[PDB]
């Protein structure tokens, strides 16, 4: 081991656990909820207020979540979700069929439906997404071909939340990650990434997963220095509960692939 290996994810990552610990979106102002609320506002600002639209968006390291895709789905016609953990894909798929024993995302869904103008209702927001999500593929950011042999058109947007820091055991592995992800996008295409800053781990209940503790300095470096212009970059100091993670806040950026 050392830094959580690929198949520690295959074997110890519990989708349902994860969701409960991070995504229950309680009415009590928990660190996990403050952070979630912010990822939300940002994703709204990016996909509904800015000029981030397109035909195709690949969401990388989706894991078992969809919150990151509630706004994007008012901007893209085709949404391909991906993850390295087959059992996370299984949990997402549960939600896409809208099965009764799927995690309940409506507090979240609700939160978004306001941000956006309360124009549409939960039910209609959820349907809209289900129809966007066209495929659910296996992926690996540490491979020059993250979706393997699967044929997809050059994407307009690659997006990733709380993934690259987790999958990348070191800096070089990260920058290659970024480069490999760049191979899925057309030039002038958008890279949206949201991760934790200076995070060395995070806990899913009892089990602990590694994490490359990156500064804003190094992240910006490895992105410019990996083929992208940065449209904006935001840092929030707000962290996860100490029991949860050792992060120092979280960044999010929007980057353009050089032509
Ligand atoms: N090499 C790799 N390639 C792709 N995904 C990986 C990976 N290593 C770990 N992962 C995925 O990293 C994710 C980190 S948790 C984040 C899940 C989701 N993107 C969210 O915003 O909450 C998990 O889904 C795990 O399956
Ligand atoms: N960046 C991380 O270490 C992280 C935090 C929360 C969930 N998943 C990954």
Curated annotation (Swiss-Prot):
GO molecular function (one): pyridine N-methyltransferase activity
Binding-site positions, S-adenosyl-L-methionine: 18, 23, 61, 67, 83, 88, 140-141, 161
Known outcome of mutating residue 199 to A: Has no effect on N-methyltransferase activity
Phenotypic consequence of residue 179 to K: Has no effect on N-methyltransferase activity
Enzyme class: transferase
Family stated for the protein in its record: Belongs to the class I-like SAM-binding methyltransferase superfamily. NNMT/PNMT/TEMT family.
Record protein name field: Nicotinamide N-methyltransferase
Upper classification of the organism: Eukaryota, Metazoa, Chordata, Craniata, Vertebrata
Gene from which the chain derives: NNMT
